[PDB]
């Protein structure tokens, strides 16, 4: 089996920059099978090359592919702001045929720190036997970003979920939220709850926290 | 003109079947091959099945090898998938996606006609298969109160079955510095995601603000004022 690594995880491009994503595959493969994809978000992918080296149906003029053995490259003259998405390799010189786990295409802006906000667990969750106490980052750049919770000096770990939403339209900033869920038991049972976030747009690790019921 | 429409999709509890349609047109169905592609909550795409021109090659992902069945039927332009045993892990969408129209033998020689399923340039809208054992859930709406430049305030939507949900602000009015997250499933099978928006830090004591959640699925529609 062929196992296909896009490098790098997300490009980050600015319009009229030029952009060359990287396929590396585990085996040689010929260079007449293999194929991309374009995924804006949303939608269903769209071929793009196929064949190694030939555009697909209504494909721009910028778009070209190419390679041999176990490096393929995708590459774009000049991005316009239609070409953001994500874009998956495939191959087919071997059984099973296989995708990359993709590569996403970003508008690449300046540097721009989090604002990190923290929430406790309301009182109506409370009388429901639960506990959810939220962090909030807001319009950070880059998406890159290390959330780490902390009760009363104690790292946290397994019990916290992250979401983070898709590039802002108008700033083209992210914003991500961490989730730490407790039983109401447990959440009694300590008075600091802090969440530290690291980022490239802070100089030090910045820790938001409440001490419960002040 | 050419257009593939997926169908059969929808909540199975698991273990049990499930038979995908895919209704090609436009094109001539009998030269191209045809695969099945689909893609899980907010990951890459996975291969799942495929097979040539007549049918007669027919290869399966690793993970589904045994469980599912694809077949065509040339004479009406339909594909289909047979789906069974499904576990959890089957969530996805799934694309029908059209093959091509040739094929090459090892020799080099290009023979028309005959086409399989190397690479797929027509993809359906794809048909969303959700596979889990828990019941239709409404949500419970929880307060996300600022508390100390600006102030954040959102709604904790938790506890809910299945997608989708939609926040609104005040109605249609307020739009801007709203961020509403994606959903994320959760240990207990049910999804929950969060709704926050920033306004001025002043802003609070004189304006209200309400979240509009609605889940169709389940005719809950809540509203909801945040307060410190």
């Known amino acids: 089996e062929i196992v296909l690594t896009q490098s790098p995880a997300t490009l980050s491009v600015s319009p009229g920059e030029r952009a060359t994503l990287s396929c590396r595959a585990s085996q040689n493969v010929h260079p007449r099978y293999f194929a991309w994809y374009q995924q804006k978000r949303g939608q269903s992918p769209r071929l793009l090359i196929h064949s190694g080296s030939t555009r697909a149906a209504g494909i721009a003029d910028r778009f070209s592919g190419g390679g041999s053995g176990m490096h393929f490259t995708l590459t774009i003259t000049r991005v316009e702001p239609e070409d953001f998405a994500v874009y998956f390799c495939?191959?087919?010189?071997?059984?099973?045929?296989?995708f990359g786990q993709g590569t996403r295409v970003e508008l690449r802006r300046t540097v721009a720190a989090p604002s990190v906000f923290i929430f406790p667990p309301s009182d109506e969750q409370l009388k429901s036997g639960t506990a959810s106490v939220v962090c909030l980052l807001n319009n950070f750049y880059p998406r890159e970003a290390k959330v780490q919770w902390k009760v009363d000096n104690a790292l946290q770990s397994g019990n916290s979920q992250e979401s983070v939403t898709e590039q802002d339209s108008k700033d083209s900033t992210y914003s991500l939220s961490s989730t730490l869920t407790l039983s109401k038991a447990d959440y009694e049972k300590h008075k600091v709850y802090a969440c530290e976030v690291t980022h490239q747009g802070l100089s030090s690790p910045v820790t938001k926290s409440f001490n419960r019921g002040e | 003109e050419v257009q593939l429409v997926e169908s059969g999709g929808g909540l199975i509890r698991p273990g049990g079947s499930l038979r995908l349609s895919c209704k090609g047109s436009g094109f001539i169905f009998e030269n191209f091959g045809f695969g099945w592609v689909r893609q899980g909550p907010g990951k890459g795409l996975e291969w799942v099945s495929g097979?040539?021109?007549?049918?007669?090659?027919?290869r399966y992902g690793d993970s589904v090898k045994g469980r599912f069945t694809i077949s065509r039927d040339n004479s009406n332009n339909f594909v289909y998938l047979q789906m069974n045993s499904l576990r959890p892990e089957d969530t996805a969408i799934y694309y029908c996606?059209?093959?091509?129209?040739?094929?090459?033998?090892?020799?080099?020689?290009?023979?028309?006609?005959?086409?399989?399923?190397?690479?797929?340039?027509?993809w359906g809208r794809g048909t969303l298969v959700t596979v889990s054992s828990a019941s239709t859930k409404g949500p419970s709406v929880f307060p996300l109160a600022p508390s100390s430049g600006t102030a954040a305030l959102g709604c904790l939507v938790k506890d809910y079955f299945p997608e989708p949900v939609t926040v609104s602000w005040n109605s249609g009015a307020l739009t801007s510095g709203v961020h509403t997250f994606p959903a994320v499933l959760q240990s207990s099978g049910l999804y929950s995601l969060s709704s926050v928006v920033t306004v001025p830090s002043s802003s609070l004591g004189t304006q209200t603000y309400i979240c509009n959640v609605n889940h169709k699925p389940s005719n809950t529609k809540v509203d909801k004022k945040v307060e410190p």
């Open positions: 495939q191959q087919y010189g071997g059984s099973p045929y296989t």
């Open positions: 996606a059209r093959g091509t129209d040739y094929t090459i033998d090892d020799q080099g020689i290009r023979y028309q006609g005959s086409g399989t399923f190397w690479y797929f340039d027509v």
């Open positions: 097979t040539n021109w007549n049918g007669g090659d027919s």
